[PDB]
Design a protein around this ligand. Structure first.
Ligand code: A1A7Z
Ligand code: CL
Length: 167
């Protein structure tokens, strides 16, 4: 039993809700919140901009030190950093950004990172400003993630569209 509330159950392990991931994380304080990161951990917009703003830029400060030490992530890769005031940990995961020409096949690799954590609050990878089809992102999530994932979908039209189209 966990403290996530109001989620629709899609499969044994995947749950979905129309919610603002920032507000959800502040309420639940999950062990892991997933950020829709880029390889440079430059948290400008979308989910990343929102999560970073909610940390008063502490996420960006920590991320800049991480990059200065380790260099960029790989597309499809991840790193674990602090969750600041939002969660115990933040799993920064890089899905392919279609608006940069990156290979959508890497979306499965990106979701594989979730399997290293028993429970996660997460967005749909490569959705929104990363330019992939969200119906496809949800399908890849369900077919790749085996741990317990609570998906927060920003827009109601799409939340409603994803449920009604879910197979
Ligand atoms: O991953 C992309 C996803 N983005 C977010 N998901 C949940 N909460 C969020 N808060 C701020 C951004 C954000 C998204 C899906 C459909 C339409 C637009 C954006
Ligand atoms: Cl977005």
């Amino acid at each position: 039993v966990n403290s996530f509330s109001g989620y629709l159950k899609l499969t044994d392990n995947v749950y979905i809700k129309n919610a603002d991931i920032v507000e959800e994380a502040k309420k639940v304080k999950p062990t892991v919140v997933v950020n829709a990161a880029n390889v440079y951990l430059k948290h400008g917009g979308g989910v990343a901009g929102a999560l970073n703003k909610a940390t008063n830029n502490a996420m960006q400060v920590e991320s800049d030190d991480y990059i200065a030490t380790n260099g960029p992530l790989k597309v499809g890769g991840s790193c674990v950093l602090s969750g600041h005031n939002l969660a115990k940990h933040c799993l920064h995961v890089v899905g392919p950004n279609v608006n940069k020409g990156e290979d959508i096949q890497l979306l499965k690799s990106a979701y594989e990172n979730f399997n290293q954590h028993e429970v996660l609050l997460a967005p749909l990878l490569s959705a929104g400003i990363f330019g992939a089809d969200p119906i496809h992102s949800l399908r890849v999530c369900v077919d790749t993630v085996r741990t317990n994932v609570y998906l927060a979908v920003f827009d109601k039209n799409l939340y409603d569209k994803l449920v009604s189209s879910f197979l």
